[PDB]
Amino acid sequence: SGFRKMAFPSGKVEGCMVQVTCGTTTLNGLWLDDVVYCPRHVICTSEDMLNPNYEDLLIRKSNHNFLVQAGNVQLRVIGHSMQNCVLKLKVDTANPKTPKYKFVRIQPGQTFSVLACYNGSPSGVYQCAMRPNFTIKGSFLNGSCGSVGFNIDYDCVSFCYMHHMELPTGVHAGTDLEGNFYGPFVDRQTAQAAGTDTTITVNVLAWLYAAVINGDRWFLNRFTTTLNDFNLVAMKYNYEPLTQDHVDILGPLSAQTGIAVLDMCASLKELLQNGMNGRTILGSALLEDEFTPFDVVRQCS
Amino acid sequence: SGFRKMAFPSGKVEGCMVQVTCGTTTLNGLWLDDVVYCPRHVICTSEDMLNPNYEDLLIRKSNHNFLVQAGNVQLRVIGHSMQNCVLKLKVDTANPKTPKYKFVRIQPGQTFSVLACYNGSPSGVYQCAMRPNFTIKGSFLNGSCGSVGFNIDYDCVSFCYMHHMELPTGVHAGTDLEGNFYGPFVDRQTAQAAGTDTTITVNVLAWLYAAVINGDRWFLNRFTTTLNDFNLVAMKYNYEPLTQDHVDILGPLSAQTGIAVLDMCASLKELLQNGMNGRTILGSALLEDEFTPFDVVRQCS
């Protein structure tokens, strides 16, 4: 029993983290085979943050300008190229600890583990969801850029996120490992801000099922609703629409608890309309939306 | 910015996890140098859970009865001995991935990372606090026994917890790595239950400081209280007494925010008396007590 925000074991990723320094900027890189991936803004100076032309900044670089350190061992850079908002530094040594890996881009509503790193050294691991507004609510200080987000399936590390920036509300933005930003963010100095966010309805229902599996039942009722009547209430409380695909995905959790998805929807409608009246669910006085149905199945089996 | 429940990077511990099987019981072991540590209840059968005499059960064992598997490699057991509620299985191979380590016993109110494992395979990592009642609120299914809790200081793994059991409320109990239970729990079949728990006051104050560092200020006020008047309120709400040592430990966070500890105590008193009136702190509608002052300093620098 019990239900915790649980990260993947980070060892396979720890073995890929390196330090990349350009001038006075140090951040983290990801060392896979003979390539180090890092945020291209490592090549920026204080004196060109407004409208940096990264193609010009990179043309003016030499391999020797990039100092790459894997623990106490310097890696020789033998090639540099830009890939959207990521730099690919070819090095003369293949990482012997390279795991089986993929570069996958995730959807809003999906979760992943973050290995927060400073100076190429892992400091901590935690779960994040990709918000509907394509930000993540992480924990990142200066130096954290190049820290990566990932999922592990069997022996395979699916890298989905590389950290680039903090937005004014204290939320985080970055790219996939092909260097493409999540959401309408740029690696240049602007007044850019998180857009309006919404609650991930399917995840809230998954977490209510986790609560039931773990013996919290107080919010259950005899009522069912229609998907249409549910979505009328969801829209009102800034929840995402629930689709038939969401209902289908919640199938196994529905089967395991014997609670129909639209029955659990009637519980959620009551919680949105009335609040918890001083009760808690899985140690929370808020409705939690950063667990996917998969997260619940994985942990509650 | 941001403040997350963050686990230590788990790689150093992943490299120590093995599978230990006796008869039809499989659980996890910790492989350090040429010793595998695991819960002694691996030697129990269904037919002796009431009052097992573990000294008798162990005398009847042979090294060959213990099947120890490190990935796809069987370890030959060459010695077995009991250490309180843990078994020490001497094996013919020193773990080449043994990190620098210590066996430390923690206090109630301290935190640690759990690497939840099944069949000697890590599944996930999360933070736990040792509750005042010596239980932990973890996430553990059958097969999780022998999963360990730890802290990492520089390169050194301080092992503090090994998982043994789930109590009727869904909370968890286990031992230090010398096999001594945390709290008044036994590895035998009884109606044993968690005793009354309390809130870890110093941790709640540490988390209020984390909130301030991260720009949540709404709960601040111009009021200060005495330590005595604060403790009168704490006692009333089932909070632990706050000591001068707690005030001293909160010194750095007090210095960093410019908010005196007894000033932050006046905020906590108001939150206990009035609630949050529909507001949140660091994404919580509850007062959080599983972050230590050290956890806040480590993460917020």
DSSP string across B137-183: -----TT-TT-EEEEEETTEEEEEEEEEEE-TTS-EEEE-TTSPBSS
Resolution (in Å) of the shown entry?
A: 1.8
Report in angstroms the alpha-carbon separations of B288 from B208, B221, B291.
Answer: 9, 19, 7
| CA–CA distance, B114 with B164 (Å, rounded to integer) | 13
* Catalytic residue annotation of B: 41, 145
Cβ B125–A10 below 8 Å, yes or no?
yes
Tell me the sheet residues that pair with A128: A112
Q: Taking a contact as any Cβ pair under 8 Å apart, which residues of chain A between 106 and 145 contact chain B?
A: 115-116, 122-126, 137-141
| CA–CA distance, B159 with A65 (Å, rounded to integer) | 42
DSSP annotation string for B43-108: G--GGG-SS--HHHHHHT--GGG-EEEETTEEEPEEEEEEETTEEEEEESS--TTPPEEEE-PPPT
Residue B137: list chain A partners with CB under 8 A. 2, 4, 283
Residue B280 contacts A, CB cutoff 8 Å: yes
Cβ B286–A301 below 8 Å, yes or no?
no
The answer to whether the beta carbons of residues B137 and B120 sit under 8 Å apart is no
Tell me the sheet residues that pair with A20: A27, A68
DSSP annotation string for B10-22: -HHHHTTEEEEEE
Give the chain B residue nearest A152 (alpha carbons). Answer: B123
Cβ B2–A140 below 8 Å, yes or no?
yes
Please tell me what DSSP assigns to residue B41.
G
- Burial of residue A277, with CB atoms counted within 10 A of its CB: 0-12 exposed, 13-18 middle, 19 or more buried: exposed
Tell me the sheet residues that pair with B88: B37, B81
Give the chain A residue nearest B3 (alpha carbons). Answer: A139
Cβ B299–A139 below 8 Å, yes or no?
yes
Residue B141: list chain A partners with CB under 8 A. 1, 300-301
Task: Return the structure tokens found at A221.
Answer: 């009722």
- Burial of residue B278, with CB atoms counted within 10 A of its CB: 0-12 exposed, 13-18 middle, 19 or more buried: exposed
Best mutation site among A125, A135, A169, A294 for testing chain B: the one with the most B CBs within 10 Å? Answer: A125
The answer to whether the beta carbons of residues A38 and A30 sit under 8 Å apart is yes
Residue B63 contacts A, CB cutoff 8 Å: no
What angle (nearest 5°) sits at the alpha carbon of residue A272, between those of residues A271 and A277? 45
| CA–CA distance, B293 with B127 (Å, rounded to integer) | 15
Quickly count: other Cβ atoms within 10 Å of residue B244's Cβ: 9
Distance from CA of A59 to the nearest CA of B (A): 33
> For A2, which of B1, B10, B140 is closest by C-beta distance?
B140
| CA–CA distance, B294 with A184 (Å, rounded to integer) | 36
Characterize B31-70 residue by residue with b for buried, 16 or more Cβ atoms within 10 angstroms of its Cβ, and e for exposed. bbebbbbbbbbbbbeeeeeeebebeebeeebeeeebebbb
Angle between helices B261-274 and B201-213 (to 10 degrees): 100
Rg for chain A (alpha carbons), in Å?
A: 22
The answer to whether the beta carbons of residues B128 and B138 sit under 8 Å apart is yes
Which conformational region is residue B18 in: left (phi greater than 0), alpha (psi within -120 to 50 degrees), or beta?
A: beta
| CA–CA distance, B190 with A213 (Å, rounded to integer) | 24
| CA–CA distance, B243 with A151 (Å, rounded to integer) | 43
What would the 3-class secondary structure string for A254-299 be?
HHHHCCCHHHHHHHHHHHHHHCCCCCCECCECCCCCCCCHHHHHHH
| CA–CA distance, B95 with B72 (Å, rounded to integer) | 14
Strand (E) or helix (H) holding B136: none
Q: Which ranges of chain A does DSSP label H, i.e. alpha helix? A: 11-14, 54-59, 201-213, 227-236, 244-249, 251-257, 261-274, 293-299
Residues contacting B11, CB < 8 A, separation 6+: A9, A10, A11, A12, A14, A15, A122
| CA–CA distance, A207 with A141 (Å, rounded to integer) | 30
- Burial of residue A142, with CB atoms counted within 10 A of its CB: 0-12 exposed, 13-18 middle, 19 or more buried: exposed
Distance from CA of A291 to the nearest CA of B (A): 14
Q: Which amino acid is at B284?
A: S
Q: Which amino acid is at A32?
A: L
Strand (E) or helix (H) holding A86: strand A86-91
Using CA atoms of B171, B174, B176, B181 in order, give the dihedral in degrees to the nearest 10: 110
Catalytic residue among A16, A22, A38, A41, which?
Answer: A41
Distance from CA of A89 to the nearest CA of B (A): 25
Give the chain B residue nearest A8 (alpha carbons). Answer: B124
The answer to whether the beta carbons of residues B141 and A301 sit under 8 Å apart is yes
Residues contacting A255, CB < 8 A, separation 6+: none
Best mutation site among B3, B97, B139, B256 for testing chain A: the one with the most A CBs within 10 Å? Answer: B139
Residue with tokens 């093995």: B18
Residue B285 contacts A, CB cutoff 8 Å: yes
Report in angstroms the alpha-carbon separations of B274 from A145, B179, B268, B269.
Answer: 40, 44, 10, 9
Decide the pairing of beta strands B73-75 and B67-70: antiparallel
| CA–CA distance, B115 with B30 (Å, rounded to integer) | 11
Give the chain B residue nearest A280 (alpha carbons). Answer: B286
Sheet holding B17-22, edge to edge: B73-75, B67-70, B17-22, B25-32, B35-39, B86-91, B77-83
Residue B3 contacts A, CB cutoff 8 Å: yes
Residue B280: list chain A partners with CB under 8 A. 286
Decide the pairing of beta strands B156-166 and B100-103: parallel
State the architecture of A201-300 in CATH terms. Answer: Orthogonal Bundle (1.10)
Residues contacting A106, CB < 8 A, separation 6+: A112, A130, A160, A161
Distance from CA of A118 to the nearest CA of B (A): 11
> For A11, which of B15, B139, B214 is closest by C-beta distance?
B15
* A300 a catalytic residue: no
**A165 φ, ψ to 5°?**
-160, 160
